[PDB]
Amino acid sequence: ASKDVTGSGEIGGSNSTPKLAIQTSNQVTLTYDGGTGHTYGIATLHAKGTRKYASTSNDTKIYYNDNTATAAPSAPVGTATIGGSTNWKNAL
Amino acid sequence: ASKDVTGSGEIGGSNSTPKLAIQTSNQVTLTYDGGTGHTYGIATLHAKGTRKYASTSNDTKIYYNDNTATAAPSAPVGTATIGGSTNWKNAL
Amino acid sequence: ASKDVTGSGEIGGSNSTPKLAIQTSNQVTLTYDGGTGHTYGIATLHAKGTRKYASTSNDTKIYYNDNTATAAPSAPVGTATIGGSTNWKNAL
Amino acid sequence: ASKDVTGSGEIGGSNSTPKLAIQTSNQVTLTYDGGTGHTYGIATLHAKGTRKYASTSNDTKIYYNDNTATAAPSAPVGTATIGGSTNWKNAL
Amino acid sequence: ASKDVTGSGEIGGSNSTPKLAIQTSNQVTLTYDGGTGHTYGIATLHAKGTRKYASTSNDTKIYYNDNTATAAPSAPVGTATIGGSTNWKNAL
Amino acid sequence: ASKDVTGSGEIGGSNSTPKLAIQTSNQVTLTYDGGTGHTYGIATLHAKGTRKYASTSNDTKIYYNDNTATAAPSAPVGTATIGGSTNWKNAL
Amino acid sequence: FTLIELLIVVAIIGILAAIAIPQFAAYRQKAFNSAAESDLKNTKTNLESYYSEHQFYPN
Amino acid sequence: FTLIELLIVVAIIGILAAIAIPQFAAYRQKAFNSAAESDLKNTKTNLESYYSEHQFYPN
Amino acid sequence: FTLIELLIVVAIIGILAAIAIPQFAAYRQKAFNSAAESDLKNTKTNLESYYSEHQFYPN
């Protein structure tokens, strides 16, 4: 799914899998999508911020976009880079 | 050849060989020379930097030179160390 | 003998035997004793360090001593462990 | 018997048989049971760990259990696999 | 037949013949075909892999193909090599 | 003759004699000379190697030479050892 | 303790956090392929072991 | 040099000092478990080594 | 969060990135030579196998 988190929270747990506890900073919101489990898609946006950093398992650097509303990167289906897409590629 | 790369790019591909994608940091320039294929010669220089790190397959440590213009280490022809040459040997 | 090495150097070569080139880190000093040739005794001490790691062919783990002056482990004469001696046994 | 070992120690020696010296890692505890001598049963548990790996002579892979208290695998009496038992089968 | 196996399983057993137990690695899938019994055809493909290794009784080396879907090598009918076929010959 | 082979190939066949198929490793080159047929002379040299192993029918051990260019051992004319010659005798 | 120094600290943190980490998917795929290779070799050895007690491969 | 700037500096310092550092207990437990794994594998190898000189495992 | 700490971090990173990795060319050459050795031994065995069906080596 797309279970977001802020402050302290829990991530994953479907199909009775173990769930880890993710604790972010003061008031930063994080959007997560785990897909089937092979890959992950992360995103980050401060509440009073002007950037929306995001990345993915297959990528090798953090990408940002100055819109703070560019949805979130879904889990890529196999070795698929997200740096270069329309909603991204403003490379850090 | 001496196909350099910066940001995101591709390395190799001659004689229909598979080509890997190398993604460097923000604005760091990398100079690569693969030779026939047995060895490789790497180099690195930040745009607003003061050092030019480089190494090679046969070597065992990174060597630098405070000139930012010392060409690049070509692919050595067989078990040939580059640490000790005139353009290098300022050992890290 | 007890030919030590630091930076880049050469080890062995007696009785016209082939000599390998050992290249250590930046400013780490290594003390080596090869004996007749069956066994070896190694040691290591950083210049601005607080430990003197050492080991031997017959041993199975690295041993240290917080004196930085505990000589060096000579080549043991046959299946002789050095972990347990007075100058050692502070097991890692 | 069930002579466990940690650090450096000795294993076996009954009926005036030769005894080998087993030297484990820093603070890992190993539980051993040799039985009559045809088979062996091994186990391993780090002091500050969360897993208890174990195996046996007749088996072909290491099995673990997230309890750190699941006793130890005794020596099997003849070609008896331990992977599948209640205290095990969480295959690696 | 073409009874595949993964984890721990059993191979063969037709015509009341003895059946051996094959235990593979963590999550590697193995495809087996025994034919009448003179020859065997093996294959291997990791779940999160990019290669499909395979071999046969009459062959002398493992062959791979970068498709992970190239069926499996059936039991050859008499001294028949599989290295050279269309679905193979990318020699290791 | 001196029909060399690499990868997969065929050896012999003169005077309508049966020819066997020799399949070497990945990229190892083998030099063969069968002479009249009483004896054989074999040799081996990896492409990216530093040794040239060779032997013969009348010999009893493999001999090497650190030149990777020492021709090849021709078929000896009757119970003639090749270990001791100038191009050889660096006994394994 | 100066507003200039903290801004420079933020800039340097942003510079350091953008370092390109190495590719990991291929690194793990290497281990997966090696596991497949070892499993195939061990399967061949086990089959030839079975061919010793009896005189036919399984099935 | 202005009382406003120093207060803003204090606020930014308080903001930066609250950064959530990564979990470390699990990170070290990973290394501990890997050490246990390697020790078990080496023990198996040593036992099979002993089984070569003689024809029985220890004890 | 202090300009001193980040500079020390940069210094430690530079210290750690200069570690002398082991030589690898010779390590791979070992495997290449072992492959050559095994190939030669297997070739000898195959030739002596051929010498059984017939009464002469190839050619």
Side-chain angles (χ1 to χ4, degrees), chain A:
Chain A
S2 277
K3 173 154 180 22
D4 82 5
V5 79
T6 176
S8 86
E10 298 209 339
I11 272 282
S14 68
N15 322 62
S16 35
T17 53
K19 42 178 41 201
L20 85 173
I22 275 163
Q23 308 171 324
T24 68
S25 161
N26 186 359
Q27 57 185 332
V28 51
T29 312
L30 177 139
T31 301
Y32 175 101
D33 159 3
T36 86
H38 308 146
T39 85
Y40 69 87
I42 212 61
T44 297
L45 161 60
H46 200 291
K48 305 192 262 311
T50 66
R51 276 183 150 95
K52 181 136 190 173
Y53 306 87
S55 179
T56 207
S57 164
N58 319 102
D59 262 20
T60 39
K61 35 202 310 195
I62 308 183
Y63 290 95
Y64 72 91
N65 186 290
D66 281 35
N67 204 287
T68 80
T70 54
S74 41
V77 316
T79 78
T81 62
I82 87 175
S85 313
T86 67
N87 279 333
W88 303 114
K89 87 183 171 323
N90 223 291
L92 200 45

Side-chain angles (χ1 to χ4, degrees), chain C residues 58-61 63 81 83 91-92, chain D residues 7-8 21-27:
Chain C
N58 319 102
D59 262 20
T60 39
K61 35 202 310 195
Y63 290 95
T81 62
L92 200 45
Chain D
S8 86
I22 275 163
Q23 308 171 324
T24 68
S25 161
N26 186 359
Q27 57 185 332

Side-chain angles (χ1 to χ4, degrees), chain I residues 6-50:
Chain I
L6 292 200
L7 288 200
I8 272 297
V9 159
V10 169
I12 280 173
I13 270 178
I15 272 183
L16 271 190
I19 292 288
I21 58 175
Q23 323 164 19
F24 289 127
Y27 290 12
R28 256 124 54 182
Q29 289 185 338
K30 298 299 176 317
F32 299 139
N33 296 346
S34 169
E37 191 146 60
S38 87
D39 157 53
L40 201 147
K41 255 299 277 199
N42 299 328
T43 312
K44 268 174 90 140
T45 306
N46 299 346
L47 286 187
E48 283 297 325
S49 156
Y50 184 11

Side-chain angles (χ1 to χ4, degrees), chain G:
Chain G
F1 54 95
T2 73
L3 202 53
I4 173 59
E5 187 192 72
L6 292 200
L7 288 200
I8 272 297
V9 159
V10 169
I12 280 173
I13 270 178
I15 272 183
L16 271 190
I19 292 288
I21 58 175
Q23 323 164 19
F24 289 127
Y27 290 12
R28 256 124 54 182
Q29 289 185 338
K30 298 299 176 317
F32 299 139
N33 296 346
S34 169
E37 191 146 60
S38 87
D39 157 53
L40 201 147
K41 255 299 277 199
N42 299 328
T43 312
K44 268 174 90 140
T45 306
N46 299 346
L47 286 187
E48 283 297 325
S49 156
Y50 184 11
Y51 196 55
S52 324
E53 271 146 29
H54 307 79
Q55 301 281 328
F56 52 86
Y57 288 123
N59 217 323

Side-chain angles (χ1 to χ4, degrees), chain B:
Chain B
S2 277
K3 173 154 180 22
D4 82 5
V5 79
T6 176
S8 86
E10 298 209 339
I11 272 282
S14 68
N15 322 62
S16 35
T17 53
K19 42 178 41 201
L20 85 173
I22 275 163
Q23 308 171 324
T24 68
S25 161
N26 186 359
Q27 57 185 332
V28 51
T29 312
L30 177 139
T31 301
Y32 175 101
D33 159 3
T36 86
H38 308 146
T39 85
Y40 69 87
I42 212 61
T44 297
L45 161 60
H46 200 291
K48 305 192 262 311
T50 66
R51 276 183 150 95
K52 181 136 190 173
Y53 306 87
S55 179
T56 207
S57 164
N58 319 102
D59 262 20
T60 39
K61 35 202 310 195
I62 308 183
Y63 290 95
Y64 72 91
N65 186 290
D66 281 35
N67 204 287
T68 80
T70 54
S74 41
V77 316
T79 78
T81 62
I82 87 176
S85 313
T86 67
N87 279 333
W88 303 114
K89 87 183 171 323
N90 223 291
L92 200 45

